[model samples]
Target: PIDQEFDCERFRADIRATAAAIGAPIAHRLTDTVLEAFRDNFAQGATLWKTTSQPGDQLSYRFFSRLKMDTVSRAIDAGLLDAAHPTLAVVDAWSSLYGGAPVQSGDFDAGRGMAKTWLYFGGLRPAEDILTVPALPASVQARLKDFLALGLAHVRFAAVDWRHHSANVYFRGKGPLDTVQFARIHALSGSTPPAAHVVEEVLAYMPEDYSVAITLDLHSGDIERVCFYALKVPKNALPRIPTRIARFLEVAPSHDVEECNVIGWSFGRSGDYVKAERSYTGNMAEILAGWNCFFHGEEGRDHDLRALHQH
Candidate 1:
């Protein structure tokens, strides 16, 4: 997008005033997280910044950075989460490809329902399907908006790549599903309880279309190689986003988590699947349908199926 190839003179002149705005602590944390996330996959390489999303892709370094600053970084500034939070920790989860396949994070035993390794709480869905959205306490709304912003910046601005995005999505209020997970969350993050009742966002980013997997199963980080995929969609061809639900939205089944359940996010495109090989021999769709049973109902039907709370 620039005319010259890293013109040092112009770069210095342009960033002089902007660079002056950064403070100490944030700069410290940003360097740490960005460095670690890229450590196992990258460090010193021609690929300091690499991805499947090309220059012409729908990737928005501008908006990604904007959201990072406005949503996530601001939350850090406001004392919500820091680089040390569990939600922000190096994630671990199971990857199930085909039905008969071995689970990645491994087998588990829980008191009720099928124990899940990654429980994804989403913001993309409520922005679309939900009708009557609830308002977050004005203070909560402001902070949450900041928290979600960090979702994309590392990919665009910093030369960091993400393998799994594990976050606790905050809502306007509490939900039933949240009770158990919140207990587990407090078990670890007791020193830093999230002000808003939140659910986990353990999902993938579609570097090809920017679409989110509404439901996601984990992949083998145990596998040696790391993925360098990402995406960008142009404004003109972009699908219209539902008016973003400001605080909460009215939906069914998920009890208090109605706004957070089973929805996907992308700048454009509806929920889409990943590539075939990555999809575990194309059994991904069937697996997702069954997995939806936990939040929605039995397979496609509407019925209370989630037998247990958290694993």
Candidate 2:
């Protein structure tokens, strides 16, 4: 298990300061909304529903769907889900629910299947962007907008490389980072950015001994693209990330770092590990066990093979 402590107090201050420096004072507020959305969804048993094409499935949608599943699985294992039901089976079943086999018959009722599948899965879509959820409290919404704006700023920083690569100036291998940059830009430049003060307030509320991680699901207006990044404070600083920097990054208190783990997924995007699905499944089980151990004081056990095979 990844056992790392973070000085969240310092991180919170650094992040808040950073956001203020950048003229984006609402970063912390947006972070709260995003985290609250995840928590609310877990509490409500919500499944992410997104659009897909019948004739040619959109890469971005597929990408976001998969990423959402991975995150949801993590939330479940973390005891964020009501009663922490074993989620792998449901996730895998849903993965295959759309149809494990390739379309042998062109006549498959794509629209009907898509609707039915999303319904069964309890689909949830972000109000604006993947990280911004409408169900969050007003205060949270304001904060998340600011945090998202900062995230967009990070994306903007990355776009320089993306633009260079597009012109064949940089190696094609750098595309994923470029995409990450682009998604952040999209989130912020939209009609309304998340509020700034909410982010500040959330940062103030963060505990001292915790780490924050942010996972983004990216899209290109139409197709789902890739799971962008899972960021963490370096382990050397046991629970003490610079507050200015943390707020700048829009940090939040999720599951304790001791009980949390992160895994990234990509179907074809750059920086993706092979067997992404299996790896994510394995990692999620480990994290879930960690959460169980932390909350219930139970010795963590290996992933039940029967459960794995069944899924």
lDDT of 2 at 164: 13
If scored against the real structure, what TM-score would every candidate get? 0.20, 0.20
lDDT of each: 0.21, 0.25
Candidate 1: regions farther than 4 A off: 1-26, 36-231, 240-311
**TM-score (C-alpha, index-matched) for candidate 1:** 0.20
Model 2 / residue 60 / CA error / Å = 20
- For lDDT, the strongest prediction is 2
lDDT of 1 by residue, 2-43 (tens): 431223233222222222221101233433333233222111
lDDT of 1: 0.21
Q: Which stretches of candidate 2 lie over 4 Å from their true place?
A: 1-228, 231-245, 248-251, 254-311
RMSD of each: 20.0, 20.2
Range of the 10 consecutive residues with the lowest summed lDDT in candidate 2:
163-172
Model 2, range 122-233, lDDT digits (tens) per residue? 2111113222323223432343454434322111100101111110000011111233343453243232322454233323322221112222221212111222222222
